[PDB]
Design a binder for this molecule. Structure first.
Ligand SMILES: C[C@H](O[C@@H](Cc1ccc(-c2cccc(Cl)c2)cc1)C(=O)Nc1nnn[nH]1)C(=O)O
Length: 303
């Protein structure tokens, strides 16, 4: 069993490197952030441009959706996060507190909290309603590349250039686990699996790893792509077959059979590093995005 992803739409508009792409949970929209200090909203099924959201003073590294698809959270080099009401385009809150670039962000499933990570080596937990910082965790000894909440929001997974993945108790802020393989390459990305038993981590030694968090064991390894420098997102594709999807420094989208770990498809088309990919929550759609030499988002579909 192999998928058949084929290019359907190319989305131009960003004037600088695209940093992240995310589909709304309701499946209606695609959000993109860029080094151009802007967030763009696109139609998930046709790639039709909807709107631009601006206000950040420097490049945006990440964007994330709230569970009801009404809010966006963005992380910027202007050392803030911003909470946006998508429909009205308004900036609800500006989260000030990090001392360096904010590199990653996410909402919890209940979307009353925001987790953020920064070049200041900390993980912060914010109140969505007030925009106040509830906890500052002295999480790592190098920049925090990714942060993500589990299925019920009781755990936060963080990764850093220091070579570690750490699991934090949302309520106490105590470190529950430190995950590392025998090698120490910088960990550029991490995320909990859709149902939360696993963690998918990306290292800067051209490797994707699937860990069983509880047992502290690496269960699967996915190789064949190139990733020695950039914080490339990776994803679980679960609408058709069960796959692992990731961008690559060789300008391709790689797709792996999750169980067998073999490459099932490679998507050719971008002219620069595929920095980010996203999988549609209900349809076999992959959104992919590239750096400065390309500046486009591509929408691929499988039948
Ligand atoms: C179905 C979809 O996602 C799945 C993705 C998945 C699928 C399979 C394996 C896995 C792990 C170890 C060995 C092997 Cl042979 C497979 C790992 C992840 C998921 O989240 N499973 C999940 N999370 N927590 N507990 N079960 C969804 O939940 O919509």
């Amino acid at each position: 069993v192999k998928p058949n992803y084929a290019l359907k739409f190319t989305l131009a508009g960003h004037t600088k490197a695209v940093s992240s792409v995310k589909f709304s949970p309701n499946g209606e929209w695609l959000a993109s952030s860029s080094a151009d200090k802007l967030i763009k909203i696109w139609g998930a099924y046709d790639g039709k441009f909807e709107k631009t959201i601006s206000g950040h003073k420097l490049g945006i590294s990440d964007v994330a959706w709230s569970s009801d698809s009404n809010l966006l959270v963005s992380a910027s080099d202007d050392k803030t996060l911003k909470i946006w009401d998508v429909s009205s385009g308004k900036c609800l809150k500006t989260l000030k507190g990090h001392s360096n670039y904010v590199f990653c962000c996410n909402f919890n499933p209940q979307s009353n909290l925001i987790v953020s990570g920064s070049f200041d080596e900390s993980v912060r937990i914010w109140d969505v309603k007030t925009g106040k910082c509830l906890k500052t965790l002295p999480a790592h000894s190098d920049p925090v590349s990714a942060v993500h909440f589990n299925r019920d929001g009781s755990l936060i997974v963080s990764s850093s250039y220091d070579g570690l993945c750490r699991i934090w108790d949302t309520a106490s802020g105590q470190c529950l686990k430190t995950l590392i393989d025998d090698d120490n390459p910088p960990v550029s990305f991490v995320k909990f699996s859709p149902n939360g038993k696993y963690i998918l981590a990306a290292t800067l030694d051209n490797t994707l790893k699937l860990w069983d968090y509880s047992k502290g064991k690496c269960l699967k390894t996915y190789t064949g792509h190139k990733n020695e420098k950039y914080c490339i997102f990776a994803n679980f594709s679960v609408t058709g077959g069960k796959w692992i999807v990731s961008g690559s420094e060789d300008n391709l989208v790689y797709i792996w059979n999750l169980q067998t770990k073999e490459i099932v498809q490679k998507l050719q088309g971008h002219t620069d590093v595929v920095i980010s990919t996203a999988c549609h929550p209900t349809e076999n759609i992959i959104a992919s995005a590239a750096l400065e030499n390309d500046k486009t988002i591509k929408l691929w579909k499988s039948d």
